[PDB]
RNA sequence: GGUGAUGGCCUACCAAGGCGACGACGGGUAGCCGGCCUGAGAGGGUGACCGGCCACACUGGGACUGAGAUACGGCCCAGACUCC
RNA sequence: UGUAAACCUCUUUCAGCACAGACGAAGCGCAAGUGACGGUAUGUGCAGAAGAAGGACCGGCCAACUACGUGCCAGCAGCCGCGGUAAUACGUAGGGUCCGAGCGUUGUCCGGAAUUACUGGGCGUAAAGAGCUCGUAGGUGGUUUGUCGCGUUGUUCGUGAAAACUCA
RNA sequence: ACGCAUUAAGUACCCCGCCUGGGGAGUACGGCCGCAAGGCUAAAACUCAAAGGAAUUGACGGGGGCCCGCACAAGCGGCGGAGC
């Protein structure tokens, strides 16, 4: 179907996984 | 509870003239209000509602009351419109009024509710007093003699009766033979858009 | 794979009917033959064969069709189909397009349909509906 | 689906979701007015719509709308509080209601006055 | 003495160079009130003249419906589009109870008791193309009998041939007071 | 042994089994039903009056008496609360 | 507005005033009486319309429409949304309508919702085929003979308390 | 609807997986797997009255094709600079 389906996922994942980059270490020291 | 209000008006937004004898209807044709003589958007709810109304107020029946004839009617065999039209009609209000004591059911009521009759010896006040085959109507001593019954056995001549009913004597004793069939009714009504308007 | 003839004979009834076809020839069974008796008594088709085939016993059912094409049969429909077996007493029996059609039951009493078995006043398995 | 997909993971309703959890299944409810003041509905719409932060006995703080013309209200007022949808104004789901020992009814109301707490005047 | 219903009436929008330019579609119905009915669909820039040629279209398209007294012969559910409208057939003094648009071509056919319910589409356009083909999927006994190859009792029940025959009865005989 | 009575109900010993994806064990919620409301029905929701069963009687535990006891308006203990 | 009203006539239900006055009790008592309800219900008479009607709604769903005032304010609204000086959507008047000692609102449940679809849905693009296979449990099972009669079906018995629901 | 159309998206049967408005979110918490990246399972609050699918008519395109116009190109004369 329609592309824009795709973007709002698209964006939602782009921006978690800047989110996780950016806490990559803080998730590290958290969890571990 | 009952509408003691103005008759003309409901038979005026209705359409049929219940009872007759006004010329602002009748020479300009219009429901009541300053809106009369409209334009109507012709829905089938309006009509249905039309033709409820038309009954309810045609006899003294409140909408509570009018429901729970028309579940009886449901309920009980045969067609749920005619039953509900031998229902309405077989009350004492009604009766009387088709056996012409008193030739509108306001003052059927009335003289039930007074008790200015009675039913098989015992005393009646009630106008929904749902009477059945082989009644007797009898009318008081007092009630006889009164004005109103003097001008019954007067004037019944006017209007003509039922077959199931028929009154025996000049003290204006009623019959009812059986209850009535829809040819026996002669109201100026269909009755189906009603059972569609509850079946709503 | 195969899991229930009686659908497969229905369907290729349907199919051919559908198609406007003259014959349906399809594998035998016993229960297939009667519902082909019964088709063919409440008159939706014009008659049923048994033969041999290479291997075992075909049914060739004639269909019926009217002078214009009008076909005998509107439809058919499994009921009691193998994972939802439906069964039927002798009173809440169903009744096919109001009446106008057979429901197909099988019962004690044999293949026989569901105003045979409520007048032998008994039930069971609905195997098709056939309006 | 199957009719043992059925049997084994069966049908389930979707969920219902709960309503006016402040009112706590009660049809209104008694609170103070933590806060009356005014709020901008949505873009269409436009005026100064009076609302309240109500402390409800349901240990609980929901905004809530202030029908009708004029409105007493201050803080500390004891106020009762329906339920009722105001569309232009997004996060709110009450009413309050007059009546309610503190909320008189509206002034000069004559046609639907049952819904404003306003007495007939004879 | 045709009975004709509007269903709805609708204005569609074209667009062009300069703008929206309108018209209006009506979906008009119209019967005999006696068993035959036609639908129509009629577009034109004005609302009564989209009415007429709703009308033309219906009684150039009409089509007569199977009934056992003022009802139905059987129970079908039709399908159009998206319109899936099925049809019960009832007793009498139920009424024809049914949304307008089924409603609607229903009164017009005649079929004053009637169960109908629209279950997908509530478009009213489809829904009437969808009654349509359920009246159209409507089978009378006596063309079943001869699509059998068989008698009509053996065919047919007994509470419908008894229905048919008071209904037969209520028409010739009392067909005395049109005729004389 | 115990019970009115069968039974790990309890005990010594013996064997090592038993239950679990067909959801054990846990967590949450809840008295159950006839019925009630709705609904075309299937179903959904509910468990007010009325009627039946259960459970409880400040909390927890315990027995005694007795044909019969969760013994509301009985007993013992402990605890909280109130009072002399 | 509005046969509405005024005015003529009638009627007295109900309420009020006076008198009587229970059934409930083949009961209890072998004592002479015994009814809490109760001097109640109810019957008799008495006077006169005499003491007795509000509430919601009127843009569509949803019958029922105008005027005035306010014009993105005040406000309304369940959804669509209405108010941006000519508002049938706000407020008030009239008028109409729906009910009627009720009327509306809120809350809760079902319906409508075939919107968890057994009856009664679907999955190419609308939400929906696991990335594909293997295979366990499970589900399902080609033709045919015989048997069991578990399912199934028929019949009968018992039960399915009463009340409820339904029919009379 | 586009389209599928004996390689069905038809007619039917069996079994499995999956959906139940859009966002939030295939995210958090928990758990499992993994060296890690991350994956798998998988919500709620809150929020919107839509999100969406196909197709139609137009408009538009730094899409295409064909054709026009002092539109460009080829020329002539100017304005913009001065004064009025």
């Known amino acids: 179907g329609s592309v824009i389906k795709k973007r709002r996922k698209r964006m939602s994942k782009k921006k978690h996984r800047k989110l996780l980059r950016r806490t990559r270490v803080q998730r590290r020291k958290l969890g571990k | 509870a009952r509408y003691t209000g103005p008759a003309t008006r409901k038979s005026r937004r209705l359409g049929?003239?219940?009872?007759?004898?006004?010329?602002?209807?009748?020479?300009?044709?219009?429901?009541?209000?300053?809106?009369?003589?409209?334009?109507?958007?012709?829905?089938?709810?309006?009509?249905?509602?039309?033709?409820?109304?038309?009954?309810?107020?045609?006899?003294?029946?409140?909408?509570?009351?009018?429901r729970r004839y028309y579940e009886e009617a449901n309920r009980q065999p045969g067609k749920t419109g005619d039953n509900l039209l031998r229902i309405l009609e077989s009350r004492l209000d009604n009766v009387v009024?088709?056996?012409?004591?008193?030739?509108?059911?306001?003052?059927?009521?009335?003289?039930?509710?007074?008790?200015?009759?009675?039913?098989?010896?015992?005393?009646?006040?009630?106008?929904?007093?749902?009477?059945?085959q082989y009644d007797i109507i009898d009318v008081k001593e007092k009630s006889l003699n009164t004005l109103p019954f003097q001008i019954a056995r007067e004037t019944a001549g006017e209007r003509p009766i039922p077959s199931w009913l028929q009154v025996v004597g000049e003290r204006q004793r009623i019959l009812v033979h059986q209850?009535?069939?829809?040819?026996?009714i002669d109201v100026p009504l269909t009755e189906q858009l009603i059972v569609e308007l509850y079946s709503k | 794979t195969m899991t229930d003839p009686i659908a497969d004979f229905l369907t290729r009834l349907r199919n051919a009917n559908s198609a406007y076809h003259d014959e349906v020839t399809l594998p035998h069974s016993k229960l297939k033959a009667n519902i082909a008796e019964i088709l063919k008594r409440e008159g939706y088709i014009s008659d049923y064969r048994t033969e041999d085939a290479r291997v075992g016993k075909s049914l060739v059912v004639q269909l019926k069709y009217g002078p214009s094409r009008e076909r005998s049969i509107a439809g058919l429909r499994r009921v009691s189909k193998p994972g939802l077996r439906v069964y039927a007493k002798s009173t809440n029996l169903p009744r096919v397009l109001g009446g106008l059609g057979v429901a197909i039951i099988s019962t004690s009493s044999g293949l026989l349909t569901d105003r045979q078995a409520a007048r032998q006043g008994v039930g069971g398995e609905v195997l098709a509906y056939v309006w | 689906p199957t009719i043992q997909q059925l049997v084994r993971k069966g049908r389930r309703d979707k969920i219902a979701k709960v309503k006016t959890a402040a009112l706590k299944g009660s049809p209104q409810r008694r609170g103070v007015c933590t806060r009356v003041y005014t709020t901008t509905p949505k873009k269409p719409n436009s005026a100064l719509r009076k609302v309240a932060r109500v402390k409800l006995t349901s240990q609980v703080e929901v905004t809530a709308y202030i029908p009708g013309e004029g409105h007493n209200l201050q803080e500390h007022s004891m106020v009762l509080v329906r339920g009722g949808r105001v569309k232009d104004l997004p996060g709110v789901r009450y009413k309050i209601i007059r009546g309610s020992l503190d909320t008189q009814g509206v002034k000069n109301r004559k046609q639907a006055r049952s819904r404003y707490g306003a007495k007939k005047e004879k | 003495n045709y009975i004709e219903r509007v269903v709805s009436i609708?204005?569609?929008?074209?667009?062009?160079?300069?703008?929206?330019?309108?018209?209006?579609?009506?979906?008009?119905?119209?019967?005999?009130?006696?068993?035959?009915?036609?639908?129509?669909?009629?577009?034109?820039?004005?609302?009564?003249?989209?009415?007429?040629?709703?009308?033309?279209?219906?009684?150039?398209?009409?089509?007569?419906?199977?009934?056992?007294?003022?009802?139905?012969?059987?129970?079908?559910?039709?399908?159009?589009?998206?319109?899936?409208?099925?049809?019960?057939?009832?007793?009498?003094?139920?009424?024809?109870?049914?949304?307008?648009?089924?409603?609607?071509?229903?009164?017009?056919?005649?079929?004053?008791?009637?169960?109908?319910?629209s279950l997908g589409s509530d478009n009213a356009i489809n829904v009437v193309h969808a009654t349509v083909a359920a009246l159209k999927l409507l089978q009378r006994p006596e063309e079943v009998a001869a699509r059998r190859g068989l008698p009509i009792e053996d065919v047919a029940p007994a509470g419908m041939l008894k229905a048919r025959r008071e209904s037969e009865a209520l028409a010739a005989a009392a067909a005395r007071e049109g005729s004389a």
């Open chain 2, 16 to 66: 049929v003239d219940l009872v007759g004898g006004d010329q602002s209807f009748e020479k300009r044709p219009y429901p009541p209000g300053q809106h009369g003589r409209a334009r109507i958007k012709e829905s089938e709810y309006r009509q249905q509602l039309q033709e409820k109304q038309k009954a309810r107020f045609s006899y003294g029946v409140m909408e509570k009351q009018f």
């Open chain 2, 97 to 132: 009024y088709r056996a012409g004591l008193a030739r509108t059911r306001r003052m059927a009521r009335q003289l039930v509710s007074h008790g200015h009759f009675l039913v098989n010896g015992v005393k009646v006040d009630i106008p929904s007093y749902r009477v059945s």
């Open chain 2, 179 to 184: 209850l009535p069939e829809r040819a026996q």
């Open chain 5, 10 to 117: 609708n204005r569609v929008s074209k667009v062009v160079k300069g703008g929206r330019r309108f018209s209006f579609t009506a979906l008009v119905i119209v019967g005999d009130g006696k068993g035959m009915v036609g639908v129509g669909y009629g577009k034109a820039k004005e609302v009564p003249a989209a009415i007429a040629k709703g009308v033309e279209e219906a009684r150039k398209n009409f089509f007569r419906v199977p009934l056992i007294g003022s009802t139905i012969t059987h129970p079908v559910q039709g399908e159009a589009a998206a319109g899936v409208v099925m049809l019960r057939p009832a007793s009498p003094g139920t009424g024809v109870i049914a949304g307008g648009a089924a409603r609607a071509v229903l009164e017009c056919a005649g079929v004053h008791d009637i169960l109908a319910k």
